[PDB]
Design an enzyme around this catalytic site. Structure first.
Site, PDB file in Angstrom:
ATOM      1  N   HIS A  18       0.804  -1.214   0.000  1.00  0.00           N
ATOM      2  CA  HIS A  18       0.000   0.000   0.000  1.00  0.00           C
ATOM      3  C   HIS A  18       0.835   1.261   0.000  1.00  0.00           C
ATOM      4  O   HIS A  18       2.018   1.246   0.344  1.00  0.00           O
ATOM      5  CB  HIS A  18      -0.883   0.122   1.243  1.00  0.00           C
ATOM      6  CG  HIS A  18      -1.421  -1.185   1.809  1.00  0.00           C
ATOM      7  ND1 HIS A  18      -1.066  -1.700   2.977  1.00  0.00           N
ATOM      8  CD2 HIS A  18      -2.337  -2.021   1.208  1.00  0.00           C
ATOM      9  CE1 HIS A  18      -1.741  -2.824   3.098  1.00  0.00           C
ATOM     10  NE2 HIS A  18      -2.485  -3.001   2.036  1.00  0.00           N
ATOM     11  N   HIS A  61       1.126   4.631   1.993  1.00  0.00           N
ATOM     12  CA  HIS A  61       0.809   5.185   3.289  1.00  0.00           C
ATOM     13  C   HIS A  61       0.945   6.698   3.190  1.00  0.00           C
ATOM     14  O   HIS A  61       1.616   7.229   2.289  1.00  0.00           O
ATOM     15  CB  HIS A  61       1.761   4.594   4.326  1.00  0.00           C
ATOM     16  CG  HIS A  61       1.342   3.222   4.779  1.00  0.00           C
ATOM     17  ND1 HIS A  61       1.073   2.821   6.001  1.00  0.00           N
ATOM     18  CD2 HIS A  61       1.164   2.140   3.967  1.00  0.00           C
ATOM     19  CE1 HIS A  61       0.750   1.553   5.968  1.00  0.00           C
ATOM     20  NE2 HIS A  61       0.799   1.139   4.729  1.00  0.00           N
ATOM     21  N   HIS A 101      -2.882   4.232   5.786  1.00  0.00           N
ATOM     22  CA  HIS A 101      -3.045   4.183   4.341  1.00  0.00           C
ATOM     23  C   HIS A 101      -3.484   5.557   3.850  1.00  0.00           C
ATOM     24  O   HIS A 101      -4.258   6.262   4.514  1.00  0.00           O
ATOM     25  CB  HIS A 101      -4.106   3.188   3.917  1.00  0.00           C
ATOM     26  CG  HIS A 101      -3.787   1.739   4.220  1.00  0.00           C
ATOM     27  ND1 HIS A 101      -4.609   0.731   4.025  1.00  0.00           N
ATOM     28  CD2 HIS A 101      -2.616   1.244   4.740  1.00  0.00           C
ATOM     29  CE1 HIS A 101      -3.987  -0.362   4.410  1.00  0.00           C
ATOM     30  NE2 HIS A 101      -2.789  -0.060   4.835  1.00  0.00           N
ATOM     31  N   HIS A 112     -10.955   0.532   3.936  1.00  0.00           N
ATOM     32  CA  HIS A 112      -9.993  -0.314   3.247  1.00  0.00           C
ATOM     33  C   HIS A 112     -10.664  -1.286   2.295  1.00  0.00           C
ATOM     34  O   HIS A 112     -11.705  -1.845   2.642  1.00  0.00           O
ATOM     35  CB  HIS A 112      -9.188  -1.047   4.330  1.00  0.00           C
ATOM     36  CG  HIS A 112      -8.041  -1.826   3.733  1.00  0.00           C
ATOM     37  ND1 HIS A 112      -6.894  -1.355   3.247  1.00  0.00           N
ATOM     38  CD2 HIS A 112      -8.094  -3.171   3.531  1.00  0.00           C
ATOM     39  CE1 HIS A 112      -6.256  -2.393   2.752  1.00  0.00           C
ATOM     40  NE2 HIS A 112      -6.995  -3.444   2.921  1.00  0.00           N
ATOM     41  N   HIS A 159      -9.293   2.730  -0.037  1.00  0.00           N
ATOM     42  CA  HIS A 159      -8.421   3.863   0.217  1.00  0.00           C
ATOM     43  C   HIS A 159      -7.695   4.161  -1.095  1.00  0.00           C
ATOM     44  O   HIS A 159      -7.393   3.191  -1.803  1.00  0.00           O
ATOM     45  CB  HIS A 159      -7.346   3.550   1.257  1.00  0.00           C
ATOM     46  CG  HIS A 159      -7.836   3.140   2.634  1.00  0.00           C
ATOM     47  ND1 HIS A 159      -7.285   2.249   3.451  1.00  0.00           N
ATOM     48  CD2 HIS A 159      -8.882   3.730   3.292  1.00  0.00           C
ATOM     49  CE1 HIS A 159      -7.951   2.303   4.591  1.00  0.00           C
ATOM     50  NE2 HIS A 159      -8.911   3.195   4.479  1.00  0.00           N
ATOM     51  N   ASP A 206      -4.587   1.715  -1.535  1.00  0.00           N
ATOM     52  CA  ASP A 206      -4.740   0.274  -1.547  1.00  0.00           C
ATOM     53  C   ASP A 206      -4.355  -0.352  -2.882  1.00  0.00           C
ATOM     54  O   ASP A 206      -5.029  -0.195  -3.898  1.00  0.00           O
ATOM     55  CB  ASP A 206      -6.190  -0.077  -1.195  1.00  0.00           C
ATOM     56  CG  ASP A 206      -6.575   0.226   0.248  1.00  0.00           C
ATOM     57  OD1 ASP A 206      -5.723   0.460   1.125  1.00  0.00           O
ATOM     58  OD2 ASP A 206      -7.772   0.232   0.503  1.00  0.00           O
ATOM     59  N   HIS A 257       4.052  -5.290   3.373  1.00  0.00           N
ATOM     60  CA  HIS A 257       3.737  -5.920   4.637  1.00  0.00           C
ATOM     61  C   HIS A 257       4.237  -7.340   4.759  1.00  0.00           C
ATOM     62  O   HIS A 257       4.595  -7.959   3.761  1.00  0.00           O
ATOM     63  CB  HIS A 257       2.234  -5.934   4.853  1.00  0.00           C
ATOM     64  CG  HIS A 257       1.747  -4.566   5.281  1.00  0.00           C
ATOM     65  ND1 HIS A 257       1.676  -4.074   6.511  1.00  0.00           N
ATOM     66  CD2 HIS A 257       1.295  -3.599   4.407  1.00  0.00           C
ATOM     67  CE1 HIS A 257       1.203  -2.851   6.421  1.00  0.00           C
ATOM     68  NE2 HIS A 257       0.981  -2.580   5.153  1.00  0.00           N
ATOM     69  N   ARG A 273       5.420  -4.166   8.928  1.00  0.00           N
ATOM     70  CA  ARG A 273       5.886  -3.446   7.756  1.00  0.00           C
ATOM     71  C   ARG A 273       7.373  -3.729   7.651  1.00  0.00           C
ATOM     72  O   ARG A 273       8.143  -2.950   8.220  1.00  0.00           O
ATOM     73  CB  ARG A 273       5.656  -1.936   7.972  1.00  0.00           C
ATOM     74  CG  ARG A 273       4.243  -1.550   8.361  1.00  0.00           C
ATOM     75  CD  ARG A 273       4.165  -0.061   8.644  1.00  0.00           C
ATOM     76  NE  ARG A 273       2.818   0.224   9.072  1.00  0.00           N
ATOM     77  CZ  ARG A 273       2.338   1.465   9.194  1.00  0.00           C
ATOM     78  NH1 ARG A 273       3.063   2.552   8.938  1.00  0.00           N
ATOM     79  NH2 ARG A 273       1.065   1.620   9.543  1.00  0.00           N
TER      80      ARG A 273
HETATM   81 CU   LIG Z   1      -0.006  -0.879   4.430  1.00  0.00          CU
HETATM   82 ZN   LIG Z   2      -6.143   0.627   2.963  1.00  0.00          ZN
END
Ligand SMILES: [Cu+]
Ligand SMILES: [Zn+2]
Ligand SMILES: [Cu+]
Ligand SMILES: [Zn+2]
Lengths: 153, 153
Positions: free
Chosen positions: A46, A48, A63, A71, A80, A83, A120, A143
């Site tokens: 994602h 951020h 995010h 999400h 988001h 995403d 992730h 992360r």
């Molecule tokens: Cu993330």
């Molecule tokens: Zn998200």
């Protein structure tokens, strides 16, 4: 416009993510090559909100979500902006691929330049689990690596 | 608007540079704390064009110069936008300070968000030597550390 993030961390995961967008209305092409992941897995990927690396991947924040939605998967309407779903790793733990996305932009008020990409350690449930947490992070877990998106030529 | 760059490299130099600008017309306040430098020295400090870290500090490119001027001191009229001069290191090799600058912006078409900060291993001659090189880099030498400028809160 082109941009790039180099993903680094202390956990053995590292990679490069490139972005290209010609004009504001056009989709952005995202291409990535990330190594050191669990083999044959799906890992959450994602953008951020913040490009702040003062405290590892923690200071990248939540995010990127300028429109205040929950999400979801990259193909969901309710998602988001940041995403990008799961990337799949092969038998050597490498994730490599590319896709086009129409919410992620390098131009205009929602530009992701100066923000962070995070890979992730767990699978993103795409906002389909139960918890409130599924609607926030997809329960994608820690992360291991991240990088600030910077401009390139 | 606030932004931050974390300077990293393989040479023992590292640090944090923070930027703050309220609106486009206002000066940006730059504050930095960089360690691991030669003690009691002056070291070149600039914003380079690209936030590309794929090849160390090399891929950051030239000094950010949208107006195509020659290299100078931060108080010169003729200076690259990215020219922040020399920072002074103390007896423990730490450079720490802050200043306001009216060419460096975080807002608008010359935004430095997504570009790179570079701390050099040599003194910047402020475009006053002889060579053509003084008018390009200030002969500030190698780039021991650098970081992409990212958005923060
Ligand atoms: Cu993330
Ligand atoms: Zn998200
Ligand atoms: Cu420089
Ligand atoms: Zn310069």
């Amino acid at each position: 416009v082109q941009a790039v993030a180099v993903l680094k961390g202390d956990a053995g995961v590292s990679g490069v993510v490139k972005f290209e967008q010609a004009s504001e209305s056009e989709p952005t092409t995202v291409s990535y090559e990330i190594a050191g992941n669990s083999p044959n897995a799906e890992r959450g990927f994602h953008i951020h909100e913040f490009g702040d690396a003062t405290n590892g991947c923690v200071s990248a924040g939540p995010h990127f979500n300028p429109f205040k939605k929950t999400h979801g998967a990259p193909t969901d309407e309710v998602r988001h902006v940041g995403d990008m779903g799961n990337v799949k790793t092969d038998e050597n733990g490498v994730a490599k691929g590319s896709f086009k996305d129409s919410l992620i932009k390098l131009i205009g008020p929602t530009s992701v330049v100066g923000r962070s990409v995070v890979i992730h350690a767990g699978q993103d449930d795409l906002g389909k689990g139960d918890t409130e947490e599924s609607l926030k992070t997809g329960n994608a877990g820690p992360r291991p690596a991240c990088g600030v998106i910077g401009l390139t030529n």
